[PDB]
Structures are given as structure tokens and as C-alpha cells.
């Protein structure tokens, strides 16, 4: 008789994995013992299609950080997680002064210390994050670009003047909370090709669902 | 002594011996705010609910015991077996009546109890290494019933010495001959399948063996008469 599970909040709860940073010792990948991750909630595959059910949305995100070595090991290493709000400058190097700009919230924690966890508010200067924008910002490549949907960047790095002694891997989970949505719309039935637009494969246009032989046979 | 009637069925029975209302509950119906309040479940009253008198089994000195399954026993029998089969769901209570006919010169004692979810367990090969599952003739014997082969453990690895913990009644030849039991619908769900699940099984075993001197009738007829109470069905096919 109850329908608590079919609510928006119920549907979008759960902290999913949306990011993974690699900080190897020897490597082509993030060679300066640091990394910048612009917040992308599409990071959880399944996500995109779920949110793209609505035209507008609003919510808060709870971020939880999981860090270890590639084998999932724990070591005595301290870390800095920096959140650079949109409009704030991300660090270009492992010594950029951005790391010390008070206006960039930062949180420190040892790998041993349990997961780091913080809540981030509804940033957008607009009244709601909008997944679809039918226009351009005052044939073009700026089509469908609602920038005021930026949540910010997360800069991660080993604390200290020198490179870390261990190879590290950070995982970022994100639980969406206090959700409100407007204007529902057709469930994506075609495969996604790009993170930006809704473009699809005009050759590989598949029928929404399983087909059959005749309309008289089951 | 007097005779009661339910439609076209008229049984001659004793005034009103002690009846055993299993678990203190009376076979009642099921209200409107349930799982299927749409498909209003039709409740048979007419012929469907009356006195069925199963093929009498003959008690012998060597008899090990008998058991029937429910509702299996009736899904074959008459207009009730009619509903049970061509219907999707079923819930029904039962009035069971068991009687023997013996001279004051016979002796015996039959325990008669009802056991929910009576799950048969065969011998398993003998030595214990064969995972043989009881047949269909053993799991749902019908209206002829079936004979225990290991009464002591009730063909299922449980002491019979403890069967009294179930709605039971005794039939000691030197005191009574008829035993009666009212059974409510018992299952983890409001309704269920009438052909796949046997909510319970009627058990009747000789605890004290039948005996008599040469010359007296050697077999004591046991007559099971039973009637459905507040029986309901849903989803015709």
C-alpha cells in the first residue's frame, strides 16, 4: 500500500561512484602527483539517462572520498582535497598558489582516517540545473550549452613539498539529496555518443524494444 | 443420535462428541481490503460445500497408518474438484469427521491429527547417499490416501510420539468411535494454488494395534466424511 520508494529522492539517493583519480609513481598519467576533476555527475554510467528524464532539476550532493593504493592498501600518507568553486582558478601545477587560496575549501585527511565526506550546495546562478538548453549563449558549436550548470572542480594531491612515496587511487562517490524535478520527457531510447549533445547514430537507429515475428504470435 | 444434512448429503452421526477446533480458530472468510479486491473472489455455498464420504479404508492388525493431503484429496472429487482446478486461487476451511464401526469385542486406538505443510521424506536409497525425492503418488495420493511405511517417524524423520502437538483427537475403540476436527485456512499467504500446494495433511495411525478373537470381523471400516468451510476461489480459467 505504500509508495515511498517511487519518490524522486528515493530514486536518486544512493552514493554512486562518479570519479576515480590515479596518482602513479612512474607514469604517463598525472605525472605531477596531483589531479583536477571537474564535477561530472554522469560519472556513474547509469546516471545520465535517469536524470535526462526531466528537463529541470535541483539538489545537493554529498561527496565521500575513498583512497588507497591500487591493491586497495592503506598507508601513512596525508592528502589534500581542494574544492575550487566555479569561477575560481584550478591549479596548473603541484605548487600553484591556488592550493593555498582560503576561498577554495580544502580538507585534509590521512589514508588511515575513514572516508572524507562533505556536502556541496546547489551552485547554479539559475533557479535550476537544466539538462537541455535549446539555444546558444549570447550551425554552431555552442548549441545546448547551459554553462550555469557547473558545480565546480575537485583538486586532489599528496600533501608535502615532494612526490608521495606510494602509488595512489582516489574514488569519489556522490549521493544526491533534496531533489526537485520539472517537465518530464521521453526516456532516451538510443545510444549516447557524446557527453555534450543528444546526437545519436543515424544508421544504427534501433527500435526501443525487443521485436517479434508476427503480431499474432507470442 | 441424530442426522444432519447439507444439501443432498445426509450423514447419520452421534449427537455432538467433543470437537477439536484446530488452534482455537474458526474457518472464516477474507475481507475486501486484501491483495485482490478487484477480482472479487466468488464463495461457493450451494453444492460445492457439503458432505463428501471418501472410500472407506479397512483397519487391520498389520495396518501401519494412513494420510491424505489437502486440498489434493478433493481436487479430483466432484464439483469442488471442479472449482479447485479451473480457478487460480483458493482458501478454504475444513470439517473432518472420522468414524469406525466395531463390536465391543475389538480393541484399538487411532490418533487422528492434522499437520500443516506435511512434507514427505522417503528412505533416500537406504544407506543415506541417494537424493531420491518422493513421487507424485506419495506427495498427493488423492482420495484413496496413502500408507505410512515408517509410522514411528511419520515418513519424514519426526517422532510421532510428539504428533499430539498438532490438532489431534483420539479414537479408542472402548470409549468412542467418531472423532471430529475443524481446520482453519493455514498458510503464509491469504490465498494460494489448489493443485500445487497442500496446506496440510490428515493423519490417522493405529497407536494401539487392532485386535480381536478369531471369528469377529477382522477389518474395521474407517469412514472419512469431510465438508469445506468458507471456501473461496478467484480467477476462472
Amino acid at each position: 500500500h505504500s509508495t515511498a520508494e517511487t519518490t524522486l529522492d528515493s530514486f536518486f539517493s544512493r552514493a554512486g561512484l562518479v570519479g576515480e583519480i590515479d596518482l602513479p609513481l612512474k607514469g604517463t598519467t598525472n605525472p605531477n602527483g596531483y589531479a583536477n576533476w571537474d564535477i561530472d555527475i554522469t560519472g556513474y554510467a547509469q546516471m545520465r539517462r535517469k536524470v535526462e528524464l526531466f528537463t529541470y532539476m535541483r539538489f545537493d550532493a554529498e561527496f565521500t572520498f575513498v583512497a588507497c593504493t591500487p591493491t586497495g592498501e592503506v598507508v601513512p600518507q596525508l592528502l589534500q582535497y581542494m574544492f575550487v568553486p566555479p569561477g575560481a582558478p584550478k591549479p596548473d601545477s603541484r605548487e600553484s598558489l591556488a592550493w593555498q587560496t582560503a576561498t577554495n575549501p580544502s580538507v585534509f585527511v590521512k589514508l588511515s582516517d575513514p572516508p572524507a565526506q562533505v556536502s556541496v550546495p546547489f551552485m547554479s546562478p539559475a533557479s535550476a540545473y537544466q539538462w537541455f538548453y535549446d539555444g546558444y549563449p549570447t550551425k554552431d558549436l555552442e548549441y545546448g550549452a547551459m554553462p550555469n550548470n557547473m558545480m565546480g572542480t575537485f583538486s586532489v594531491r599528496t600533501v608535502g613539498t615532494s612526490k608521495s612515496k606510494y602509488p595512489l587511487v582516489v574514488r569519489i562517490y556522490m549521493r544526491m539529496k533534496h531533489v526537485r524535478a520539472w517537465i518530464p520527457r521521453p526516456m532516451r531510447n538510443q545510444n549516447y555518443l557524446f557527453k555534450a549533445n543528444p546526437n545519436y547514430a543515424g544508421n544504427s537507429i534501433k527500435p526501443t524494444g525487443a521485436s517479434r515475428t508476427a503480431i499474432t504470435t507470442l | 443420535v441424530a442426522q444432519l444434512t447439507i444439501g443432498n448429503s445426509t450423514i447419520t452421526t452421534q449427537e455432538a462428541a467433543n470437537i477439536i477446533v484446530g488452534y482455537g480458530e474458526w474457518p472464516s472468510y477474507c475481507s475486501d481490503s486484501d491483495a485482490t479486491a478487484v477480482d472479487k473472489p466468488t464463495r461457493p455455498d450451494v453444492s460445492v460445500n457439503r458432505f463428501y464420504t471418501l472410500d472407506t479404508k479397512l483397519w487391520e492388525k498389520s495396518s501401519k497408518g494412513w494420510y491424505w493431503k489437502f486440498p489434493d484429496v478433493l481436487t479430483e472429487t466432484g464439483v469442488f474438484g471442479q472449482n479447485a482446478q479451473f480457478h487460480y486461487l483458493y482458501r478454504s476451511g475444513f470439517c473432518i469427521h472420522v468414524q469406525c464401526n466395531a463390536s465391543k469385542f475389538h480393541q484399538g486406538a487411532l490418533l487422528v491429527a492434522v499437520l500443516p505443510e506435511y512434507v514427505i521424506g522417503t528412505v533416500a536409497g537406504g544407506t543415506g547417499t541417494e537424493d531420491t525425492h518422493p513421487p507424485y503418488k506419495q506427495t498427493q495420493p488423492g482420495a484413496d490416501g496413502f500408507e505410512l511405511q515408517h509410522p514411528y517417524v511419520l515418513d519424514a524423520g519426526i517422532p510421532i510420539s510428539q504428533l499430539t502437538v498438532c490438532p489431534h483427537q483420539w479414537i479408542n475403540l472402548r470409549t468412542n468411535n467418531c472423532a471430529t476436527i475443524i481446520v482453519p485456512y493455514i498458510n503464509a499467504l491469504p490465498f494460494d494454488s489448489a493443485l500445487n500446494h497442500c496446506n496440510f495433511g490428515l493423519l490417522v495411525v493405529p497407536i494401539s494395534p487392532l485386535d480381536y478373537d478369531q471369528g469377529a470381523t477382522p477389518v474395521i471400516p474407517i469412514t472419512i466424511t469431510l465438508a469445506p468451510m468458507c471456501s473461496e476461489f478467484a480467477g476462472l480459467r
Partner: protein, 239 residues
């Protein structure tokens, strides 16, 4: 200080624990929510919306995909002939996948409620005739012929009188669990069936096309429900 003993589960990270965490920007006052039309609050709102049911889910040829939306009736079909058939399986493959209901059932594990299909005749206004639409509850096998289906829960539809008709599916329940291959799937079995037969033939006057199509629209009643969030999809965000 104040005496305390830590209990198991201390320091653990439950991906479903909905506790509170520290606000990164304590002073920030997020731009106020203003009024926006059509806010959705509970998905079951969506489930009660009529979506086109691709009953005719047979053509796959890219340019004939629009054909899945409508099936047809014609003069050529003789009285009694079976026009079309399908099951009342919202979550399983087939026709229901096209409906919004179907797609939402996919993000859930269990469900139950009464459904509701509406048929729309889009033929010429001059056409007339009767179609028999019958529902065979779960278990009952597709009726042999029109007459046997005529004895079941049926509806005679005269599109000469009313261009629309709505059928209600009393009940469907995806509750019976199944562990087939080695992958456990809470499946139907309640595949209720909806058959449609030409009660009479398609009748038309000179000047009107001898074929017309029909559109199936489905939704669930207000008594519908779903349980167990289960994210599943073939479409995902590409690298």
C-alpha cells in the same frame, strides 16, 4: 569527558547511509528556487500517463520503425480472424518496452496494480464494423477461436459508434521469483493475455481506403506500485 564505547560499524562507509555531512560552503546562499510548471514528485505520476504501446513490434527496418506504433485492420480479414495479440507484461520485453510505464518498471524489481489499454481507431470516418477484444487471465491459454474468446472477459468494439475504447487489466503481479541460468530474475508468470478478433469484417463505401490503423495507449491505474530500486540499462554514458 563523557563515557562512550564504539560499536561495530564504526568508521564504515555505507553507500546508502543517508546521514549528514559538513557543508563545504557554510556562508553560501544558493540562488532561490522559483516556480516552474509541471514539477514531478513521485514517479507513479508518470506511470499513470498514456504512452503509445508498440503492439506491432515487428518491423525493424530503420525506415519502418514508425510502423511499430500502429497495427492495421482491413477488408481482406474475414469474420472471426485473429487481428492481434500480446501479454500484460509491463516490465518484460516486447510491446511494453515502448510505453513509459515499461521503461520505469526497469528501474525497479517488483510491482503490481491494474493496467489500462486504450485503443484508437484512425481509419476513415466512413468505415464501420466490430472488433472483439478479450482478456484471458494468467494461465488461461489464448482462446482457440473468436467464439471461445467470446465466452471470456471480452468487449465488442464498434468503431462505427465510438472511435475509442479503453480496457482495464484487473491485475498483474511480477512477484514470483525465478533463478534460471544462474542469474535470479523476479519474473511475471502473470502474462495476462489480450486477444483481438474481427467480430465482423471491415465495411466501407466506395471512396474510402480499405485499410486503417489502430493505436494502443497504456498506463497503470492509481493502484499501481513498484518496489526495489534496480538501476539497469543498455544505454550508458560512453567514454
Amino acid at each position: 569527558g563523557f563515557p562512550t564505547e564504539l560499536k561495530p560499524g564504526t568508521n564504515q562507509f555505507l553507500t546508502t547511509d543517508d546521514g549528514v555531512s559538513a557543508p563545504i560552503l557554510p556562508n553560501f546562499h544558493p540562488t532561490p528556487c522559483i516556480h516552474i510548471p509541471g514539477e514531478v514528485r513521485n514517479l507513479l505520476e508518470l506511470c499513470q500517463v498514456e504512452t503509445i504501446l508498440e503492439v506491432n513490434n515487428v518491423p525493424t527496418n530503420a525506415t519502418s520503425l514508425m510502423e511499430r506504433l500502429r497495427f492495421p485492420v482491413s477488408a481482406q480479414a474475414g469474420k472471426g480472424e485473429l487481428c492481434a495479440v500480446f501479454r500484460a507484461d509491463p516490465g518484460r520485453n516486447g510491446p511494453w518496452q515502448s510505453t513509459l510505464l515499461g521503461q520505469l518498471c526497469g528501474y525497479y524489481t517488483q510491482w503490481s496494480g491494474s493496467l489500462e489499454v486504450t485503443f484508437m481507431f484512425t481509419g476513415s470516418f466512413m468505415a464501420t464494423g466490430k472488433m472483439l477484444i478479450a482478456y484471458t487471465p494468467p494461465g488461461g491459454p489464448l482462446p482457440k477461436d473468436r467464439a471461445t474468446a467470446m465466452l471470456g472477459t471480452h468487449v465488442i468494439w464498434d468503431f462505427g459508434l465510438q472511435s475509442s475504447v479503453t480496457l482495464v487489466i484487473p491485475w498483474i503481479s511480477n512477484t514470483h521469483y525465478r533463478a534460471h541460468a544462474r542469474d535470479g530474475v523476479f519474473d511475471y508468470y502473470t502474462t495476462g493475455l489480450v486477444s483481438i478478433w474481427y467480430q465482423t469484417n471491415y465495411v466501407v463505401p466506395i471512396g474510402a481506403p480499405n485499410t486503417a490503423y489502430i493505436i494502443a495507449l497504456a498506463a497503470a491505474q492509481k493502484n499501481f506500485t513498484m518496489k526495489l530500486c534496480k538501476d539497469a540499462s543498455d544505454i550508458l554514458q560512453t567514454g
